Structure 1
Amino acid sequence: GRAVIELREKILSGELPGGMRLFEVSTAELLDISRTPVREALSRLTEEGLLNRLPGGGFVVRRFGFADVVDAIEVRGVMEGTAARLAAERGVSKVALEEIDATVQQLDLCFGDRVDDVDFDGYAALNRIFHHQLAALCGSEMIRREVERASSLPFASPSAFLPDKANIGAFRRSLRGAQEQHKAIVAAIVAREGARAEAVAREHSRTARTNLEYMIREAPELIAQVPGLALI
């Protein structure tokens, strides 16, 4: 319920920092909520990967460094590469293929005549749809939920490195190449080219890594706009 939302907000803002131990009574007091919803909130946020359970009881706010962000992006890329390869090997229905191709055609409409001209917000929304469609493309529920789970951490999400404030020249310029990769993923799946589909979908996740590296080096003010990046 609302206990999950409030607790999640306090973890993501760094208010409850990594390594902080949390107990049902002391957390219920901190949030000013009953123990029953707090119990559910602590357990749900362990399942989400924001907290770890301690031996002997209680919870601890999970610590994330830059290396964890890079590894989580790498795991999303590996899992998205798996969804793409399995769709290419097993085949995709006419309908599912038509839907993902429609999203790709829609994403092309985000790009103007100059290298800088990109509808950043439209791209970010359509990009989420494309990645959800790719995760479900092979028709396996197990694959879909594992791909979605690898994309569940705030900084591991496909549109995590495209926040509203990152609508700048350098990030927009990068989206052209990223969209060419969306097209190649679909073309490889259609052609039953599993190795290519996996290779492009895995490489595509290096765009978020390259963006993260740009935020660290050239635009540190952007770090705070990425969900989860306030935890680092």
Structure 2
Amino acid sequence: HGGRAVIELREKILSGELPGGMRLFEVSTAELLDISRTPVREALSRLTEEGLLNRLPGGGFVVRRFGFADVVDAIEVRGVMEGTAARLAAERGVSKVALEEIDATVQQLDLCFGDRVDDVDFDGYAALNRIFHHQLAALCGSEMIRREVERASSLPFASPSAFLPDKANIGAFRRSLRGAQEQHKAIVAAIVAREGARAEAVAREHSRTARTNLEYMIREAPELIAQVPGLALISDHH
């Protein structure tokens, strides 16, 4: 009910239907979505937590305006937060079951690669990549860490598979997935070996793949900008 309200409202913000700087109010938003006030209230609050809306001082909400600096900083925060989770898992240790689970996801991700450099199941990688980053966040067994890492990924343009959309299935991106999969293996290896410094460094570097993919799209493939939701609304971008 409330979840269905979040999806539609998020879609209207990211499409540019509700532009940056636009003021949103409980009743006018409920009329727009043709949904009851209770789910709409949950949706507006959830999208504030997610970072798409800001609260206005006298009540109501405002659609946030993002710059390139915001995208780069969001990717940085996510990498730094995932690096913390990986380091703490290596320092504290991981349970037999949790390790078996994440190692199974890495093995499934290996099945997305073939003989030629381009032979990669892009859609299969993107779905399993989300699972790997979820399991990595929970690895150290801390709810506080899991919540803070998940919040850092909820943030705009900070999702692990955000720069891997189905329609951005290009050669240059498929070749870069082999290096990314080697990073997943290295994070788990470092955690097993109790090498916190390595686990953190690899997780931070791994997040920077998103920034490289973004920079590739601006300089070499600008038609791919519209494939990332909301990215074409960032006026700054170039």
TM, length-normalised to structure 1:
0.94
Q: Which runs of 4+ in 1 moved over 6 A?
A: none
Match of 1:121 among 114, 120, 123: 123
Shift of 1:154: 4.6
CA contact (8 A) 1:154 1:227 kept: no
> 1:101-133: CA deviations, max 9, x gaps?
111122112111111111111111111111111
Structure 1 unaligned spans of 5+: none
Specify whether residues 34 and 104 from structure 1 end up closer, same or farther in structure 2 by C-alpha distance, changes over 3 A only.
Answer: closer
What is the number of equivalent residue pairs in this alignment? 232
> 1:33-89: CA deviations, max 9, x gaps?
444443333222212221111111211101112111111111110011001000000
Cα separation, 2, equivalents of 1:137 and 1:40: 30
Cα separation, 2, equivalents of 1:123 and 1:171: 12
CA RMSD of aligned residues (A): 1.5
Match of 2:175 among 173, 176, 200: 173
CA contact (8 A) 2:123 2:166 kept: yes
Cα separation, 2, equivalents of 1:37 and 1:100: 35
CA contact (8 A) 1:73 1:156 kept: yes
Percent identity over the alignment is 100
Cα separation, 1, equivalents of 2:215 and 2:47: 28
Specify whether residues 40 and 93 from structure 1 end up closer, same or farther in structure 2 by C-alpha distance, changes over 3 A only.
Answer: closer
CA contact (8 A) 1:154 1:160 kept: no
CA contact (8 A) 1:51 1:62 kept: yes
Shift of 1:180: 0.8
Structure 2 unaligned spans of 5+: none
